């Protein structure tokens, strides 16, 4: 068994994770052995200095210590782990910043065992108390026409309400009590006696148990915290240890054929009836489904400027490139992934023909002119039913920047129909369709130059239609000057 665990460990740090998290759960005894091995490898890194292999171990510890059915009082594994990870404070950021937040979790788990798994479960179910109330909701925004039927099945399964508040409270009480009293408790008798009890008394018992766990975690001394928690649980009240897995969290599956994230506020109406907190939006993603970032754009600024969803919830978006193994792996990722990845947003200063000014953001691209006009008519419908490109005379100053701070300037006056900006600090691939000769066909000279910063000035009598990030429905014309330079709801990545 030990050598099996070691092989799996050495093959998962190369669906190799799910198999680890499915082999340990068999025996209550497999959760300590694995942890011991992890510490050994971790210590090697601490001795060596191989910077690249720390974060997967720091995630495996957190993941296993939170599923470990119980830690024997004799075993001093947490102290050895804390001593091993205390010496990473001398490492470069972010390693010290993953270790500080692991040490805090290892103090929460040293003082009040099972607190970090009862917090998670409580939250995810929405069965919190009247003292520390919270909630988490999962929305599966999936396109019926793009997602596979296998993913549609997994989604349907996940959505199905499996547990009830009664069963959830029974599981929470069983795991809070087991984590403390190990085998020395009777989980069969406790379950049988808890089954006959009513929902309200179960809620009161869990609220007292959670308050005791939190208070014990708040006690300075670790040694007395465990004894105080044990005494409190005894007042509230050898066998075989039992693995209590994570109950499935609340999930909702909605058919998203759209691209804008307006759907979410429609959902928020049944949120008025379904109630800081957090919302786990699991976006399922294809190649073109580009436009998802464009929708992110709105839900970033729009909300930042018209807070509607953020009023109660902290949004978090998860990208899926598109119970069964996919269900387990999905829930595990969503649960244990907690570090976002913010993508760069370019800033544009626009002076209108009227003279007003307002900074904006193009995440994906910036089109202008014949492309902008074409998109304008694509967004017309009846208009496009009732409704060549004369060039737009623009003086454009583009600056190539560098970390050295030496910007190399260049400029030219041109008479080009359109100009689109496209993405490679970052580089901005740019296209300039010149009208070498105006006429219903204008000579087209696609010029690809690598600009990072740009300055466009158009004649007040030559308004130019401007599209940001290919948003065909909101093109901006009547602009006379445009200055472009490279400038909660995060998207998330496991590493």
């Amino acid at each position: 068994t030990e050598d099996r665990i070691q092989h799996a460990l050495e093959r998962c740090l190369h669906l190799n994770c799910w198999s680890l998290q499915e082999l340990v759960s068999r025996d209550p005894g497999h959760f300590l052995i694995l942890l011991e091995q992890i510490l050994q490898k971790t210590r090697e890194v601490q001795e060596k200095g191989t910077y690249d292999l720390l974060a997967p171990l720091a995630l495996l510890f957190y993941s296993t210590v939170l599923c470990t059915p119980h830690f024997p009082p004799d075993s001093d594994l947490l102290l050895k782990a804390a001593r091993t990870y205390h010496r990473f404070l001398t490492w470069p950021v972010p390693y010290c910043s993953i270790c500080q937040e692991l040490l805090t979790f290892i103090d929460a788990e040293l003082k009040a065992p099972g607190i970090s798994y009862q917090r998670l479960v409580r939250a995810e179910q929405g069965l919190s108390t009247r003292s520390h109330r919270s909630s988490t909701v999962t929305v599966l925004l999936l396109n019926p026409v793009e997602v596979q039927a296998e993913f549609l099945d997994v989604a349907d399964k996940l959505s199905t309400p499996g547990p009830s508040p009664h069963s959830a409270y029974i599981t929470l009480l069983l795991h809070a009590f087991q984590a403390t009293f190990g085998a020395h408790c009777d989980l069969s008798g406790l379950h049988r006696r808890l089954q006959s009890k009513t929902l309200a008394e179960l809620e009161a018992i869990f609220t007292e148990t959670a308050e005791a766990q939190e208070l014990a975690s708040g006690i300075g001394d670790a040694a007395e915290a465990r004894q105080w928690l044990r005494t409190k649980l005894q007042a509230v009240g050898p066998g075989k240890l039992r693995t209590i897995p994570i109950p499935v969290a609340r999930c909702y599956t909605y058919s998203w054929n759209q691209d804008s994230f307006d759907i979410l506020q429609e959902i928020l109406l049944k949120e008025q009836e379904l109630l800081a907190s957090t919302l786990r939006v699991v976006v399922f993603g294809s190649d073109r489904i580009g436009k998802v970032a464009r929708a992110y754009s709105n839900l970033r600024r729009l909300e930042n400027n018209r807070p509607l969803l953020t009023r109660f919830f902290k949004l978090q978006f998860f990208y899926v490139p598109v119970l069964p193994i996919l269900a387990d792996m999905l829930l595990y990722y969503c649960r244990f992934a907690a570090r976002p990845v913010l993508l760069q947003v370019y800033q544009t200063e626009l002076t209108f023909i009227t003279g007003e000014k307002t900074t904006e953001i193009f995440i994906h691209s910036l089109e202008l002119g014949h492309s902008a006009a074409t998109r304008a008519i694509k967004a017309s419908g009846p208009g496009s039913k009732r409704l060549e490109a004369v060039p737009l005379t623009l003086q454009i100053i583009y600056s190539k920047g560098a970390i050295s701070g030496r910007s190399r300037w260049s400029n030219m006056e041109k008479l080009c129909t359109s100009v689109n900006l496209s993405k490679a600090t970052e580089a901005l691939t740019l296209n300039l369709t010149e009208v070498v000769k105006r006429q219903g066909f204008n000579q087209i000279s696609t010029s690809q130059i690598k600009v990072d910063k740009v300055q466009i000035i158009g004649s007040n009598s030559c308004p130019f239609a401007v599209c940001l990030d290919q948003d065909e429905r909101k093109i901006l014309q009547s602009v006379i000057r445009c200055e472009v330079s490279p400038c909660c709801l995060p998207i998330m990545t496991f590493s």
């Binding site: 009846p382 409704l387 004369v390």
Partner: protein, 339 residues
Amino acid sequence: SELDQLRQEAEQLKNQIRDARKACADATLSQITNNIDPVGRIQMRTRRTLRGHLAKIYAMHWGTDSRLLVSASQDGKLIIWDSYTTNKVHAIPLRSSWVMTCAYAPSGNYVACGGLDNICSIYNLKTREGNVRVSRELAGHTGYLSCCRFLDDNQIVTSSGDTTCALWDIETGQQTTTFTGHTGDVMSLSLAPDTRLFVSGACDASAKLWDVREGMCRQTFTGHESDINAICFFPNGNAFATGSDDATCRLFDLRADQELMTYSHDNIICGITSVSFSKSGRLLLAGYDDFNCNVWDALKADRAGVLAGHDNRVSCLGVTDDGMAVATGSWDSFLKIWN
């Protein structure tokens, strides 16, 4: 209960209206008009061409002088032409390039226009300094301005993509009246000879007679299989014709409260963009999306002639108050006068 009883009252009053109309449907206009001598073949010739527009022409409207005419174009310009001399009396550049309609005032002093800007910009030709100055921005519509016709120097009706029309007082810049009831974008309207009534055509494939005075819908006409793109009154003012994307025109009488005649042919497959009556009303001039502009006998319902003078869609057309000539603006960037 209350809503199902009100729904069945709706659907009973509907068949009461259908029976009140079928009762008057004793004979058709094609029967009564069988006897009158055919109008013949309308051999028409292009008298003038109005060059200067750089892109599609979307609208035009004659002045009451039957000599001046406005035209709005995709190039963002509103040109006033002197049809007789071909000289451009005005070349007004617009603040919004997405102009879709224009309307010469009967007085000749004011002109109106509008588009996706959701504003009816009124311009004064006789300015204090003689310039082309913007008199008013009639804002308030929640959709693109689809059409408008001057009642006078100070009053103007406008239709919009908010599925409504509205009477405005140019002085206050406020919607004097709002004509709600349409369930689709109102493509067109037409003021009756008596300024107290006007009809309007919408994308709901139906037309509606409105009372300017009060602001209520008096009658609703149906029969078109597609959106109504254009509408205008029969010269007398008791009937009106509608052009639709169903490749058919239709005539509606107000007093009979139903359709009198259909103008269509198997050869014609494209939708209708515009319509106009002759001074007498005997001739209905329908613009089409096949570069043609067919002339129908309003009474015989036979295709009397065809005007093929454009390389692109015949987007808009009009007739002078004296019926002396037919103007037709088109997507080919040229208007054409006909006699």
